[PDB]
Amino acid sequence: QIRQNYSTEVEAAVNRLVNLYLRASYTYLSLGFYFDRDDVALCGVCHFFCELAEEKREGAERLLKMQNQRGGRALFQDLQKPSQDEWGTTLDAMKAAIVLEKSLNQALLDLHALGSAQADPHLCDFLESHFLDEEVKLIKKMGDHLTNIQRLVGSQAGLGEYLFERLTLK
Amino acid sequence: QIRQNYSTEVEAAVNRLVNLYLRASYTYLSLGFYFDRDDVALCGVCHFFCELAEEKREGAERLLKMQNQRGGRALFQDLQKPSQDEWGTTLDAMKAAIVLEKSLNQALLDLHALGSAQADPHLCDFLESHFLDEEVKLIKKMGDHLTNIQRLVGSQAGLGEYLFERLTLK
Amino acid sequence: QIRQNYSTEVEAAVNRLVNLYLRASYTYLSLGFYFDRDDVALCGVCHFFCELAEEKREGAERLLKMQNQRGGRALFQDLQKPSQDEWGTTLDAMKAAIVLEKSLNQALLDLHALGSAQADPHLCDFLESHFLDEEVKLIKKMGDHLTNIQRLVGSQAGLGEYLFERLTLK
Amino acid sequence: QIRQNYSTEVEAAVNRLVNLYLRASYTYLSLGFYFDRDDVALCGVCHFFCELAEEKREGAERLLKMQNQRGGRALFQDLQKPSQDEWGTTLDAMKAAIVLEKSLNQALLDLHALGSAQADPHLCDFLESHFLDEEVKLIKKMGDHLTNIQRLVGSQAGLGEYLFERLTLK
Amino acid sequence: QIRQNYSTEVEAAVNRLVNLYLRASYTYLSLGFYFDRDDVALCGVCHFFCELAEEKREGAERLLKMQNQRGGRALFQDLQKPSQDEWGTTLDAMKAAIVLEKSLNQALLDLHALGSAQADPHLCDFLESHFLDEEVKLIKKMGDHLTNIQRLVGSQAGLGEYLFERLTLK
Ligand SMILES: [Au+]
Ligand SMILES: [Au+]
Ligand SMILES: [Au+]
Ligand SMILES: [Au+]
Ligand SMILES: [Au+]
Ligand SMILES: [Au+]
Ligand SMILES: [Au+]
Ligand SMILES: [Au+]
Ligand SMILES: [Au+]
Ligand SMILES: [Au+]
Ligand SMILES: [Au+]
Ligand SMILES: [Au+]
Ligand SMILES: [Au+]
Ligand SMILES: [Au+]
Ligand SMILES: [Au+]
Ligand SMILES: [Au+]
Ligand SMILES: [Au+]
Ligand SMILES: [Au+]
Ligand SMILES: [Au+]
Ligand SMILES: [Au+]
Ligand SMILES: [Au+]
Ligand SMILES: [Au+]
Ligand SMILES: [Au+]
Ligand SMILES: [Au+]
Ligand SMILES: [Au+]
Ligand SMILES: [Au+]
Ligand SMILES: [Au+]
Ligand SMILES: [Au+]
Ligand SMILES: [Au+]
Ligand SMILES: [Au+]
Ligand SMILES: [Au+]
Ligand SMILES: [Au+]
Ligand SMILES: [Au+]
Ligand SMILES: [Au+]
Ligand SMILES: [Au+]
Ligand SMILES: [Au+]
Ligand SMILES: [Au+]
Ligand SMILES: [Au+]
Ligand SMILES: [Au+]
Ligand SMILES: [Au+]
């Protein structure tokens, strides 16, 4: 047995977080393909969400690797379908993405609180190194996007949405 | 004689398809030069249609090479003049181009049905390799274009049409 | 509209196949992490299943890209959890993997039958190019594995299982 | 004086941990040379333990450097002789090594608890960066080894022990 | 003593100018970080003001080096906080920046008048070489910016402000 100072509570929460990251990966996959539709056709938005799907999957994989390193047991649940089938405008889509990220971020913070209450400094080290700072960085980028997109709507939302995709998401 | 398993029906239809591809090449030549007019002056649109003229010509040449490989006889008809002399807006032009492509694509599908009814798997192999997938890809690109162009019209179509040429057709 | 010669039946079946490939990806993710457990510890098996997870995901993505190219609409369902939580021996795991692959392969064949009944030669071209041959190749590799693993059990299954991982899965 | 926010309790515990790491280095030195005996002759095991002796020494040196950076005073005690003179089988030896590592790891965790009770975030930063994650990684590797070694014993332990040294420890 | 032909009046004025350049550096630091806010999010504006903060600091350092070369004594005062906490639009910000620069430029001219009234040609050489021409160049660039920004407001200031940041400040 390698397991040491690793509570069943953290073990479970790590499995839930894996599910959350995979689910987020799935939502980004759906977002990306929506923006590749011929009647939506915003290549740069598709690319942004494609790349985020990959980052969320990698996040899940790192959590799983850590679960195994600590002697926990990975348990997988169903991955729920994304919350929408069609995602509206780039604005709507980025708002949905920032909500998703804040929910992941909250999950990360809830796991840190569980970790320090269980006195598990390896878990706290792991989250800090690979998750907390990356999530903060991403949420700041999405907020920046949302601000630019919002500035671009009003009289001519079609024009704004094109320009954003062409000149920011490039 | 090399001819084997090659019906006179397919032979004829291959000649008609050559005519269609050459005609499409001609239409794209007209489209390209219209957008090079000093009073139209959309370089990127001209370039898009120039390149499509070349692809349609190459398509015809591949069909002809295949006609000869199978022991058929190439027969050439008049190439009808393009359906318009002036092509309106970039939007009008891309709509005309997508109609043209759907008609070529239908011709390709009608030739596949003729081919499997005649049990001619070499013909079916040929269309799949060089035509069906390329045409699908092209029609998806035109649909994407049309969606972006449409999004760019409304209050200021002049501005939209410039931006599309400068930032998508680059 | 780009949609041409693309039935709602094929559209639906393509969405189901995407689900199947993603589900298979998920199962391989579970398989890979099981073999990374400290009490299982077969690095080469983990690596084999990790790489298969990636190939199944790519398969799904190619199907989705094709759905969009044809003017269909991607619809995502829940991804069911893998069929086991623990996967037994390398033998048990490879048997489960070959069952999974035969089920994907059958789905591919059922989609080909639907495609020729609907006279959709672009779909048939797509499956042949990217799916049918790859799946056949993979199933042959798994059968080869299963044969070697089986040959290695009997008196000393522990020893056999180590050697296979070290000298075949390397 | 540079000393700031550095308790005498942490200072002492850091000195004890240095002793523990040096002692572990010494035990690995003994382990390595045992496996170099002509009547034991397992080169790859010797190499594994040689390299671990070096890592434990480096760990001690990093702790000492940190003791000085914080204005503590390094105090050295006797280094106790390793717990055995002969180490049995590769299995016995790896079990002893994992026990040693769990004891170091516990010492690291006890030092983290002392550090957060003393509100010494520099100490906590130091342990996380250079010790906690490395120790977790090492214990997972040893557990993996132990699992493979165990799988290889039974009918023919001699054969298993050779193969492990030749094909894993390479 | 190295001091030669260097009045106490110039010495004092050089110290005041150092203060002015540092203060300007500080204002540009504030400007840059305002435009990095998630609710402002104009990367190119931030970059423009960041680079100006650096140039003003370098200007101060060159003045200080010259103070020492002439045998004067550097005396530092408080650096007053920038004149605003929030800087409005890119237009407002560039207007504030041009006002700041005209005030620095006037200070440079007042120091030249003091220098020729004191018959201090080394001081006059120094200002000409490193300050007067650079400041003129910068003020011309800001005026050019202001003209482009102004041209871009009216019906759609959001759109104009985005485009300027994306296509001029790049
Ligand atoms: Au995408
Ligand atoms: Au994309
Ligand atoms: Au994608
Ligand atoms: Au924590
Ligand atoms: Au913690
Ligand atoms: Au974003
Ligand atoms: Au975004
Ligand atoms: Au971005
Ligand atoms: Au042209
Ligand atoms: Au052209
Ligand atoms: Au041309
Ligand atoms: Au056919
Ligand atoms: Au056929
Ligand atoms: Au097009
Ligand atoms: Au187009
Ligand atoms: Au294009
Ligand atoms: Au794996
Ligand atoms: Au692996
Ligand atoms: Au993996
Ligand atoms: Au088929
Ligand atoms: Au078919
Ligand atoms: Au296999
Ligand atoms: Au296998
Ligand atoms: Au293999
Ligand atoms: Au050794
Ligand atoms: Au050795
Ligand atoms: Au050694
Ligand atoms: Au700590
Ligand atoms: Au602490
Ligand atoms: Au080990
Ligand atoms: Au070992
Ligand atoms: Au090893
Ligand atoms: Au900045
Ligand atoms: Au910046
Ligand atoms: Au900055
Ligand atoms: Au002067
Ligand atoms: Au002068
Ligand atoms: Au400026
Ligand atoms: Au400016
Ligand atoms: Au500029």
Residue numbers in the entry:
A (entry chain X), B (entry chain X), C (entry chain X), D (entry chain X), E (entry chain X): 3 to 172
What do the authors say?
Among various protein templates, the self-assembled 24-mer protein cage of ferritin is of particular interest as it is naturally designed for iron storage. Using this concept, we replaced the Glu45 and Arg52 residues of recombinant L-chain apo-Fr from horse liver (apo-rHLFr) by Cys and the resulting apo-rHLFr mutant apo-E45C/R52C-rHLFr was used in the current study. Herein we describe a crystal structure analysis of Au(III) ions accumulated in the ferritin cage and subsequent reduction of the metal ions by sodium borohydride inside the crosslinked single crystal. In summary, we have demonstrated structural evidence for the formation of an Au sub-nanocluster inside the narrow three-fold symmetric channel of the apo-ferritin cage.
